[PDB]
Design a protein around this ligand. Structure first.
Ligand SMILES: *[C@H](CS(=O)(=O)c1ccccc1)[C@H](CCc1ccccc1)NC(=O)[C@H](Cc1ccccc1)NC(=O)N1CCN(C)CC1
Ligand SMILES: C[As](C)(=O)[O-]
Ligand SMILES: C[As](C)(=O)[O-]
Ligand SMILES: [Zn+2]
Ligand SMILES: [Zn+2]
Ligand SMILES: [Zn+2]
Ligand SMILES: [Zn+2]
Ligand SMILES: [Zn+2]
Ligand SMILES: [Zn+2]
Ligand SMILES: [Zn+2]
Length: 220
């Protein structure tokens, strides 16, 4: 596998969005992976509607602004037979009754695949599939005030995660006596958080913050 991957430079990744005051991270993670897979399929990078997912994927098990699962979001897109564009169905950071319009559907998926809970398996997936939906333990003050560098949190859990994000690549910063490897992770907290909306999560450091424990991607 490549020692460095960054799917943003390959056109797979849309700009950083902002979930606002709503626990819809799962929606932004799922649209991220679907935007990447649709781009691979059609050569078109189109922004997908998280609001469509928040309002409409309740039957699949999601809870709107109270949380959800990326896999349930992929199931909605399969069950629904489509997903509206971000332009047609813009994000409002609130829960509202479903407004899906089949006329504005710009994406489909045929299911999803769950990656084994090993960082090696996640790496090969990022290297060959594209951006990957993952969940991490982001429930700490250091994550909230992260600005730059490789994030490492000693109290992070490898099993208990609360935040759905998107891995768009990986790399390494090399010092004299250490290759400090990282996951390139796209947050949904606006572009003023972290590195323009991005965080470098510690990689190959015992599944730090659970990043390999709930990884999946949609199939198109
Ligand atoms: C998004 C993350 S967040 O809002 O940025 C956040 C919040 C707190 C701490 C860290 C990060 C949401 C937040 C859900 C939430 C709502 C209201 C109050 C507190 C939290 N997180 C989720 O949607 C997660 C995603 C996820 C996917 C896979 C594995 C682990 C987590 N899921 C989630 O919270 N739930 C709710 C309970 N339900 C049974 C499952 C989905
Ligand atoms: C502080 As916690 C329950 O997100 O590990
Ligand atoms: C937002 As929580 C207490 O499920 O980490
Ligand atoms: Zn560039
Ligand atoms: Zn959006
Ligand atoms: Zn409204
Ligand atoms: Zn899964
Ligand atoms: Zn938490
Ligand atoms: Zn924790
Ligand atoms: Zn928990």
């Amino acid at each position: 596998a490549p020692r460095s991957v960054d799917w943003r430079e390959k056109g797979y990744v849309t700009p950083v969005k902002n979930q606002g005051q709503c626990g819809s991270c799962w929606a932004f993670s799922a649209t991220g992976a679907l935007e990447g897979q649709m781009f691979r399929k059609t050569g078109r990078l189109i922004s997908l509607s998280e609001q469509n997912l928040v309002d409409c994927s309740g039957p699949q098990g999601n809870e709107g602004c109270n949380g959800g699962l990326m896999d349930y979001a992929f199931q909605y897109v399969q069950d629904n037979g489509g997903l509206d564009s971000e332009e047609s169905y813009p994000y409002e950071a609130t829960e509202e009754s479903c407004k899906y319009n089949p006329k504005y559907s710009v994406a489909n998926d045929t299911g999803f695949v769950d990656i084994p809970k090993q960082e090696k398996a996640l790496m090969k997936a990022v290297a060959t599939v594209g951006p990957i939906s993952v969940a991490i333990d982001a429930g700490h003050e250091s994550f909230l005030f992260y600005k730059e560098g490789i994030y490492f949190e000693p109290d992070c859990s490898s099993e208990d995660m609360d935040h759905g994000v998107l891995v768009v690549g990986y790399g390494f910063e090399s010092t004299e006596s250490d290759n400090n490897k990282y996951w390139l992770v796209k947050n949904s907290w606006g572009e003023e958080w972290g590195m323009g909306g991005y965080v470098k999560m510690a990689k190959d450091r015992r599944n730090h913050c659970g990043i390999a424990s709930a990884a999946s991607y949609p199939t198109v």
